[PDB]
Amino acid sequence: MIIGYARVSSLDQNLERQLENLKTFGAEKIFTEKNRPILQKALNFVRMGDRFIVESIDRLGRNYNEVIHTVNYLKDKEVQLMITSLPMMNEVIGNPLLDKFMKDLIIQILAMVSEQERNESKRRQAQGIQVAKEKGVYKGRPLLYSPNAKDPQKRVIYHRVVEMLEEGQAISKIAKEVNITRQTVYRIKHDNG
Amino acid sequence: MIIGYARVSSLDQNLERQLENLKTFGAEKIFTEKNRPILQKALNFVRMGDRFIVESIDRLGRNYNEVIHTVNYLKDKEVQLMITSLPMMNEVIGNPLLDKFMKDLIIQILAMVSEQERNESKQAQGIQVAKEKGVYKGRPLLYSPNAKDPQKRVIYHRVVEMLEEGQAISKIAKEVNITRQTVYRIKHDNG
Amino acid sequence: MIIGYARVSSLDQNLERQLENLKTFGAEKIFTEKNRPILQKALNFVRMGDRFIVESIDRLGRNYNEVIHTVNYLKDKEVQLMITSLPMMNEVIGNPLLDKFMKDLIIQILAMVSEQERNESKRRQAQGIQVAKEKGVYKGRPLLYSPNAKDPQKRVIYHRVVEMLEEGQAISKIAKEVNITRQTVYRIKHDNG
Amino acid sequence: MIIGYARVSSLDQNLERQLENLKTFGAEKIFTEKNRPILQKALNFVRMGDRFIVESIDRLGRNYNEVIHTVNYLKDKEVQLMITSLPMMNEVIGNPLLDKFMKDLIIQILAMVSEQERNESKQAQGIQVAKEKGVYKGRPLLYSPNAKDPQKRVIYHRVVEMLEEGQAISKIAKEVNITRQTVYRIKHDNG
DNA sequence: AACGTATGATTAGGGTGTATATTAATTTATA
DNA sequence: TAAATTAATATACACCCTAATCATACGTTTA
DNA sequence: AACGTATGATTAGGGTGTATATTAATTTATA
DNA sequence: TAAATTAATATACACCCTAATCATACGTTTA
């Protein structure tokens, strides 16, 4: 049993035409939406063997995700899905594959879209990083002990290290006195000049 | 003639694999994107009878509306479109009648999604017919040439200069005591 | 009528002795504190002509400020105040004029004390400033436009001024362009080197 | 012999006025404080029979207990004490019986006030018989020699050094990323 | 018009104290 | 553990110092 | 013992995006 | 005034980059 479903788009307020359209494709019974509850009602009405007709994909849901649900539904209840606006929906519909086909493809595409958004986050991040990484921004860790250094205290330490170098102290002593690695002290040394 | 087209996603930098996968589907000749000009080149290369292969919808355009253009292009030049991840496309392929259909469908689905994502984040284009055709509403730019306080003006410029100089956002912000979000704003706006 | 008032100090818990002591000076009726409400009671009891006896100043209040109140009270109701611990206290109040006296002096002193704490604030402050002012710390206003300068933006401005100087632009133009005084620009000039 | 003693209060820097104000009461010889050593000097100068003049109680000591000492001293050496802002004292100094009395009284009043102000703010002296005669309670000094983290030790010292060098508190704080109160703590503790 | 140079006011960057509610680190009582 | 106890920190309130700047003005020299 | 010099791990100072509740500044509707 | 509307700011959440440092070890040279 052929079933239609219409719902006036706020940009396309005409109804009647839409209706006629539907019948023009066989719509025997037609639900009309005044949350879209009617829709659900219609979907519950149809069953294996019937054909559900609508003018355009978007009439199957307020957002893509929902469309998926809708289509899925029909797919399981094994109801033919027919969409008016599609050129040649007519000659093709008679193809043994087209149904299963159209249904799946729609789902796919759509899903391939959601998991594009669920990553819009990182994507733009990774996108930005890369751009930067190209500009030569990421430069590892900056000196932890040296003037300018973030933490003012380390600045103090840095200086004392130096002072202790001019004072001619011994590396080992410097290290222990400032709780630093020898290597590090050396770095401060061959760095000072 | 089977033709592939690859372009490394910033999140998926591997290339080689992508390549092989293309060949795995028949790609004889393969164009690689290093604006996406290569793409346009590949599209011009193909012609009635060939098959254009790609890994995923998005490789056909930076934004959906471009994809539409792409797909539409192929549809008219009558080139088979094949997407590595919507494998079933394989079937219908080879029956000139159904091929159109797919494209046609692919289009509608996308064209639709182009709203559900376009009617959500509403806009630096309304500042060319409201501020360039009258007087703009809301607070005025604090940092930009013209700006009331001359010093801000100076700052604005330095921000820019530092952008061309390719400096990092964070550094700019701190150097000018501004928010990143603001520097951003100065960025998008410059153009 | 001679009236005494006792209240055991937590450091001096003996009572009885204190009592005797009071009587030893004439206490006919004696109030004993077990907020110090009894005290207020006793104070209300006395009247012009009576003598209020206590062992020590502090028995007149929980803090100096209160003692003042107490004493002031007695002074107005014209009640003789006597304090035991004072050497020659009798020899003293055996004169009628040494009453007015003691009362006033106490008040004075005490007041001259509160008005010492009332300023303990500014005192230590002014005290500290001075020390510093001596150490040569206070150094006026530091440069507003120059590298290092507090506000990063002005730092930016400073530089641009310079740049515009090397670029050989004119003072006046610099000034207007950076919303600064000529004098100031000159300062930046006659400074750079 | 009438003797005065002046010392400019940091809140009342005028000197000269204070001086005359002393002479206005008879001050023949006047000692001026530039620890208060002059004061002690003046006190040693006076002899039974003389009168010691000062503007206000507080000029007799840095803290109350010292005043007591001062007053007591004068009381024994039998020197008249006369305080400028408690003018009514003049009415009586003549007679030595009322003189003692006043002092005696002045003492009690003060001795008293010495509690109402001593039993309120409850101490860097209990760290010489608890931490220098056992083990100290509470958190350990974070900045001080001995301190666990060696770097902290280094900082501590620099704070000190900067104190002797006579630097300003605020600067010290910022330079060592410490709180002012903390720097204070290091100050009072040093000695 | 810019430049060069003054002069009295206002000022922003720096200072001096004090005090309280929190969050550390330790030793020392319970349960 | 759960106290008890003392160090730091984070914040506020209150108000002090003083050379840079600002606002101004006024001859003189460059455009 | 220090010095001189390596080598693999961990890391702290720097980065990249995004998003929300507030507090600015303006123009533009009311009442 | 009271909206309405757009700029900045102040903060958080999420997670990426990478040369200094740390921890280590191991011959060699100074005390």
Q: What is the DSSP letter of C60?
A: G
Residue position matching structure tokens 């069953």:
A47
Give kind and range of the element (H or E) at residue C6. Answer: strand C2-6
Q: What phi and psi, each to the nearest 5 degrees, are found at residue C111? A: -60, -45
Nucleotide of closest approach to C187 (CA, C1'): F20
Burial C62-79 (b: 16+ CB within 10 A, else e): ebbeebbebbbbbbeeeb
B149: chain C residues, CB-CB within 8 Å: 179
What distance in Å separates the CA atoms of residue C186 and residue C175, rounded to the nearest whole number?
Answer: 10
Query: Contact, C5 vs C30, CB < 8 A?
Result: yes
User: What tokens appear for B103 in the block?
Assistant: 């494209």
Residue type present at position D56: S
User: Which of C137, C139, C150 to mutate to probe the D interface, most D CBs <10 Å?
Assistant: C137
- Cβ atoms A4, A53 nearer than 8 A: yes
Contact D89, D102 (CB under 8 A): yes
Euclidean distance between CA atoms C58 and D116, whole angstroms: 10
Residue pair D1/D29 in contact by the 8 Å Cβ criterion: yes
Query: Residue written as tokens 């501004």?
Result: B178
- Exposure b/e, D17-53, CB count within 10 A at least 16 = b: ebeebbeebebeebbbeeebeebeebbeebeeebbbb
The 10 Å Cβ neighbour count of residue B158 is 20
- What DSSP designation does C82 have? E
Give bridge partners of residue C53 from the DSSP assignment.
C4, C82
Q: Is the dihedral of CA D184, D186, D187, D191 positive or negative?
A: positive
Backbone angles phi, psi at A139, to 5 degrees: -130, 35
- Give chain B's end-to-end CA distance (angstroms, integer): 41
Residues contacting residue A21 through CB under 8 Å, at least 6 positions apart:
A55, A84
Q: Which of C69, C55, C58, C60 is nearest to C107 (CA)?
A: C69
What is the C-alpha to C-alpha distance for residues A55 and A9, in angstroms, rounded to an integer?
11
Which residues contact residue B120 at a Cβ distance below 8 angstroms, ignoring those fewer than 6 apart?
none
Residue type, A150: K
Contacting residues for D160 by C-beta, under 8 A, at least 6 apart: D186, D190
CB atoms within 10 A of CB C159: 16
Task: Supply the residues of D annotated as catalytic.
Answer: 9
The candidate with the shortest Cα–Cα distance to B159, out of C147, C161, C156, C145, is C156
Q: Which CATH topology does C1-138 take? A: Rossmann fold (3.40.50)
User: Quick one: tokens of C75?
Assistant: 């002074």
Instruction: Measure the CA–CA gap between C171 and C157, rounded to whole angstroms.
Output: 15
The neighbouring-strand residues paired with C158 are none
D104·C113 Cβ contact <8 A: no
CATH fold of D139-191 reads Arc Repressor Mutant, subunit A (1.10.10)
How far apart (Å, rounded) are the C-alpha atoms in residues D181 and D173?
9
Whether C171 sits with its Cβ under 7 A from any strand E atom: the answer reads yes
- Long-range CB contact pairs, D44-50, < 8 A, 24+: D45/D3, D46/D1, D46/D3, D46/D74, D46/D77, D46/D79, D47/D1, D47/D77, D47/D79, D48/D77, D48/D78, D48/D79, D49/D1, D49/D78, D49/D79, D50/D1, D50/D2, D50/D3, D50/D79, D50/D80
Asked if domains D1-138 and D139-191 share a fold, the reply is no
- Tell me, yes or no, if C91 comes closer than 8 A to chain D by beta carbon: yes
How many CA atoms does the CB half-sphere of C89 hold within 13 Å?
A: 21
Q: Strand order in D29-32's β-sheet?
A: D29-32, D2-6, D51-54, D80-83
Q: Rounded to an integer, what distance in angstroms lies between the CA atom of residue D173 and that of residue D143?
A: 13
Nucleotides of H under 7 A from a protein CB: 4-11, 14-25
Spatial CA neighbour of D72 closest among D85, D60, D86: D60
- Cα–Cα distance for residue pair A30/A20, rounded to 1 Å: 10
- Closest partner CB to A152 (pick from D149, D154, D175): D175
Residue D60 is classified by DSSP as G
Nearest to B155 by CA among C177, C143, C188, C157: C157
If we measure between CA atoms, which residue out of A24, A71, A33, A65 comes closest to residue A52?
A71
Beta carbons of D10 and C126 less than 8 angstroms apart: yes
Domain residue ranges in chain C: 1-138, 139-193
Active centre residues of B (catalytic) = 9
A179 touches chain D (CB under 8 A): yes
Integer Cα distance of C69 and B165 in angstroms: 77
Task: Report the residue count for chain D.
Answer: 191
Give me B105's structure tokens.
Answer: 């469908």
Distance CA C110, CA D86 (A): 11
How far is it, in rounded angstroms, from Cα B39 to Cα B46?
A: 11
What token pair was written down for D19? 């001086």
CA distance D180 to D2: 47
Residues preceding gaps in chain B (C to N > 2.5 Å): 34, 122
- Shortest Cα distance, chain C CAs vs residue D88, angstroms: 8
Helix, strand, coil percentages, rounded to 5, for chain A: 55, 10, 35
Q: Given the structure tokens 């001596």, which residue do they identify?
A: C134
The domain A139-193 having CATH identifier 1.10.10.60: the answer here is: yes
The CA distance from C161 to C164, in Å, is 5
**Facing residues of A31 across strands?**
A5
CB B25 within 8 A of CB B54: no
Report the greatest alpha carbon distance in chain D: 68
- The C-alpha atoms of residue D181 and residue D143 are separated, in whole angstroms, by 13
Q: Is the C-beta of residue B130 closer than 7 Å to nucleic acid chain G?
A: no
Whole-angstrom distance, CA of residue B145 vs CA of residue B148: 9
Query: Starting from the edge strand earliest in sequence, which strands make up the sheet with C29-32, in order?
Result: C29-32, C2-6, C51-54, C80-83
In eight-state DSSP terms, residue A125 is H
**What strand order describes the sheet that includes B80-83?**
B29-32, B2-6, B51-54, B80-83
C177 Cβ partners below 8 Å, 6+ apart? B150, B154, C164
Spell out the alpha helix ranges (H) of A46-97: 64-77, 89-92
B92 touches chain A (CB under 8 A): yes
Give the DSSP per-residue string, D96-141. Answer: HHHHHHHHHHHHHHHHHHHHHTTTT----STTSSSSSSS---SSPP
Q: Which of C151, C152, C156 sits opposite B154 (nearest CB)?
A: C156
Instruction: Give C34: exposed, middle or buried? Use CB within 10 Å, 0-12, 13-18, 19+.
Output: exposed
- Least Cα distance to A132 among B58, B178, B158, B163 occurs for B163
Which nt has its C1' nearest the CA of D168? E15
HSE, side-chain direction, 13 A CA sphere, residue A86: 30
Show the tokens assigned to B88. 């079933």
Q: Residue B113 phi/psi, 5° resolution? A: -45, -25
